[PDB]
C-alpha cells in the first residue's frame, strides 16, 4: 500500500442552488523512504459542479498545483468545492495518479463524489419569530372545551420537505405531551417546493385537575425537517442494515423514539434518491441534514388574562 485516505469518497448531500460547500479528504505516503508525485484531476458527468481547490501537507504550503510532491509519510489535505447549478443528483470523481517512475508502475487512484443540488427550506407563518425560536399564544382556552389555532409550515426550497412534529409538555425533563390535552395535525407530512401547508394546534386543557386549571402554561412543539430525498436515502440505508439509529444519535436524544422511516402524508412515488449512490454515512448524512424548528405554545385562559383586569402594583422608590 502505497497511498493511503482518511475517506474512501465524499458526500456532499443537499447544497442549495447557487451555494457552495467544501470538504476535505487527507492522502498519506506510507513509504518511509520513497517521495510519489501525485496529479489530482475531477472527471465525471458532474465534473463541472466539482471543483480542487488548493492543495497544502504536512511539509508544504499552500499550492494551485495539480502535480503534488507527497515526501515519506507526509500528509497531503486536498480540498473540493460542491457548487451545484442545477437540480439534479450528481457523480463526479477525484482522480489521484501516483505517476510511475519506471521501477514502480504508474498506479490511478478513484474517489467517488457525490452530492444533489437543491434543499428544502422550512419557515413557519402565522407565528410570531423570535431569536432563535418561534412563538404562538393560544387566548381564551376554557377548561373542558377545545380550542384550536392554525399556523403554516412554508417550503421556500427547490426540494420537497418532510416535516415531523412532536410536542413536550416539559422538554429538558423529554415529557411528550398527552395528544388528548395538545396534539399536532398533520404530525408527519411532505411539504412540496415552493409551497405552504397549514398545520392544527388541537387544545383540549384538562377541567380535571384540583388548582391550577386556568394558570397559563407553556408547551414546546419540535418540527424535524429536511429534504424528501435524504429521507429516501435513510428509508433505503434502514433497508440494506437493519439497525443503525441507536449507533448515530445520542442515547438520550429525543430522536430515539421518533420515527421516520414509516409513510409520511402526502407523500410522493417518485424522488430522485435512485440517481443518488448509497453510501456507509447515508443514516449519518440524514440526521446532519435535519433541521430542528423550535415552536413555543402558550395556553391563555380567559378566567386569568382576559377576565382578570390588569392593574398597576404597590409600588415604592
Given at each position: 500500500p502505497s497511498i493511503l485516505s482518511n475517506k474512501q469518497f465524499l458526500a456532499w448531500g443537499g447544497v442549495p442552488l447557487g451555494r457552495t460547500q467544501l470538504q476535505k479528504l487527507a492522502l498519506r505516503?506510507?513509504?518511509?523512504?520513497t517521495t510519489q508525485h501525485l496529479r489530482l484531476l475531477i472527471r465525471g458527468?458532474?465534473?463541472?459542479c466539482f471543483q480542487l481547490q488548493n492543495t497544502f501537507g504536512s511539509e508544504q504550503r499552500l499550492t494551485s498545483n495539480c502535480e503534488i510532491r507527497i515526501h515519506p509519510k507526509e500528509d497531503i489535505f486536498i480540498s473540493v468545492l460542491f457548487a451545484p447549478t442545477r437540480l439534479s443528483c450528481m457523480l463526479a470523481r477525484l482522480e489521484i495518479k501516483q505517476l510511475g517512475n519506471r521501477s514502480q508502475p504508474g498506479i490511478k487512484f478513484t474517489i467517488p463524489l457525490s452530492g444533489y443540488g437543491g434543499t428544502s427550506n422550512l419557515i413557519l407563518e402565522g407565528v410570531k419569530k423570535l431569536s432563535d425560536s418561534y412563538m404562538v399564544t393560544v387566548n381564551g382556552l376554557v377548561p373542558g372545551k377545545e380550542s384550536k389555532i392554525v399556523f403554516s409550515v412554508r417550503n421556500t426550497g427547490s426540494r420537497a420537505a418532510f416535516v415531523k412534529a412532536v410536542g413536550f409538555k416539559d422538554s429538558q425533563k423529554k415529557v411528550l405531551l398527552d395528544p388528548k390535552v395538545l396534539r399536532i395535525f398533520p404530525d408527519k407530512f411532505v411539504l412540496k417546493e415552493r409551497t405552504q401547508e397549514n398545520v392544527t394546534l388541537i387544545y383540549n386543557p384538562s377541567?380535571?385537575?384540583?388548582?391550577?386549571?386556568?394558570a397559563t402554561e407553556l408547551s414546546t412543539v419540535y418540527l424535524f425537517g429536511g429534504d424528501e430525498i435524504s429521507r429516501q436515502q435513510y428509508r433505503r440505508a434502514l433497508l440494506h442494515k437493519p439497525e443503525m439509529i441507536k449507533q448515530i444519535?445520542?442515547?438520550?436524544?429525543?430522536?430515539?423514539?421518533?420515527?421516520?422511516?414509516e409513510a409520511f402524508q402526502?407523500?410522493?412515488?417518485?424522488?430522485?434518491?435512485?440517481?443518488l449512490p448509497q453510501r456507509p454515512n447515508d443514516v449519518q448524512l440524514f440526521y446532519g441534514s435535519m433541521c430542528k424548528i423550535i415552536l413555543s405554545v402558550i395556553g391563555e385562559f380567559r378566567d386569568c388574562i382576559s377576565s382578570r383586569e390588569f392593574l398597576q402594583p404597590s409600588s415604592k422608590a
Amino acid at each position: 500500500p502505497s497511498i493511503l485516505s482518511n475517506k474512501q469518497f465524499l458526500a456532499w448531500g443537499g447544497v442549495p442552488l447557487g451555494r457552495t460547500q467544501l470538504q476535505k479528504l487527507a492522502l498519506r505516503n506510507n513509504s518511509a523512504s520513497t517521495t510519489q508525485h501525485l496529479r489530482l484531476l475531477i472527471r465525471g458527468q458532474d465534473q463541472d459542479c466539482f471543483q480542487l481547490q488548493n492543495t497544502f501537507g504536512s511539509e508544504q504550503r499552500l499550492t494551485s498545483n495539480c502535480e503534488i510532491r507527497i515526501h515519506p509519510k507526509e500528509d497531503i489535505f486536498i480540498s473540493v468545492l460542491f457548487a451545484p447549478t442545477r437540480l439534479s443528483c450528481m457523480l463526479a470523481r477525484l482522480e489521484i495518479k501516483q505517476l510511475g517512475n519506471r521501477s514502480q508502475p504508474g498506479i490511478k487512484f478513484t474517489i467517488p463524489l457525490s452530492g444533489y443540488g437543491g434543499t428544502s427550506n422550512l419557515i413557519l407563518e402565522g407565528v410570531k419569530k423570535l431569536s432563535d425560536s418561534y412563538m404562538v399564544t393560544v387566548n381564551g382556552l376554557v377548561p373542558g372545551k377545545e380550542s384550536k389555532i392554525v399556523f403554516s409550515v412554508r417550503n421556500t426550497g427547490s426540494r420537497a420537505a418532510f416535516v415531523k412534529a412532536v410536542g413536550f409538555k416539559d422538554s429538558q425533563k423529554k415529557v411528550l405531551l398527552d395528544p388528548k390535552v395538545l396534539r399536532i395535525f398533520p404530525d408527519k407530512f411532505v411539504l412540496k417546493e415552493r409551497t405552504q401547508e397549514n398545520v392544527t394546534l388541537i387544545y383540549n386543557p384538562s377541567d380535571r385537575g384540583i388548582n391550577n386549571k386556568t394558570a397559563t402554561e407553556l408547551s414546546t412543539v419540535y418540527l424535524f425537517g429536511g429534504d424528501e430525498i435524504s429521507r429516501q436515502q435513510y428509508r433505503r440505508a434502514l433497508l440494506h442494515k437493519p439497525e443503525m439509529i441507536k449507533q448515530i444519535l445520542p442515547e438520550h436524544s429525543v430522536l430515539q423514539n421518533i420515527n421516520f422511516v414509516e409513510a409520511f402524508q402526502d407523500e410522493l412515488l417518485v424522488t430522485e434518491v435512485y440517481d443518488l449512490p448509497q453510501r456507509p454515512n447515508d443514516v449519518q448524512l440524514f440526521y446532519g441534514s435535519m433541521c430542528k424548528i423550535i415552536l413555543s405554545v402558550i395556553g391563555e385562559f380567559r378566567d386569568c388574562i382576559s377576565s382578570r383586569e390588569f392593574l398597576q402594583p404597590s409600588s415604592k422608590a
